[PDB]
Amino acid sequence: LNPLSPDIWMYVLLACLGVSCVLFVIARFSPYEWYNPHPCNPDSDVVENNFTLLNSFWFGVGALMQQGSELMPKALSTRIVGGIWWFFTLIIISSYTANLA
C-alpha cells in the first residue's frame, strides 16, 4: 500500500462505488438495452434489462481489478460509462507499477 499515498486509495475506493451506482440508474433507464432472452426468439415481448446492483457493482471491481467481466455494455450511455472507467483503472495500475519500480 506504500507506493500510492493513503489518500488516493480512499478517493479510489469510493470512486468504484461512485461510478457503480450512476451506472445502475442509467442502465435501468435505457432505450436500446431491453432485449429478449430466448435463444431463438420468435418476436416475443419478454424483454428486460440485465443490470442490477450486484451485476453493476461487480463489474466495477472487475474492470478496476484488470480481470475482464461480463455485461458488455450495449447502449451509448452504459458503454461510455465503461469506456471512461477503464481509462481511470488503466492509468492507476500503470501508475502503481511505475512508482513502485
Binding site: 480512499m10 462505488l17 457503480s20 428486460e48
Partner: peptide
Amino acid sequence: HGTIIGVTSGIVLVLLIISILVQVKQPRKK
C-alpha cells in the same frame, strides 16, 4: 475536503441503494 466529498458520494450511493432495492422488486419479464 476529501473525507467530506467522500461522505457526499456516500450519501449519493446510500440514496440510490435505498432506491435500488425497490427497483429490484419492481420489474419482471413481460
